[PDB]
């Protein structure tokens, strides 16, 4: 019983279903001239293309 209850409570502090729901993002390589570095927010952290 203890192992289960503690396990449940513990995991209630890890990523919730809405957060784990993760998608992709498309970026047109047209807004990026040769030599440049554009940053796009994504899955929290910055996405460097």
């Amino acid at each position: 019983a203890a192992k289960n209850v503690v396990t449940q409570f513990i995991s209630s502090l890890s990523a919730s279903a809405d957060v784990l729901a993760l998608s992709k993002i498309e970026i047109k390589l047209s807004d990026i001239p040769e030599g440049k570095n554009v940053a796009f927010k994504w899955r929290g952290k910055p996405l460097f293309v």
Partner: protein, 49 residues
């Protein structure tokens, strides 16, 4: 972006240097700037995720 003694990136927190490929060259930073899993299948587009 576009900083550091390797023409890549420079982290202003503790001075970690990265080359234009995103690899760690100088500083405290353990590994290289993570390369997200992406595919190019998409004309002038890039589906990352």
């Amino acid at each position: 972006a576009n900083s550091g003694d390797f023409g890549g990136y420079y982290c202003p927190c503790h001075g970690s240097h990265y080359d234009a490929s995103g690899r760690i060259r100088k500083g405290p930073a353990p590994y290289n700037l993570e390369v997200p899993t992406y595919q190019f299948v998409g004309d002038d587009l890039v589906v990352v995720g």
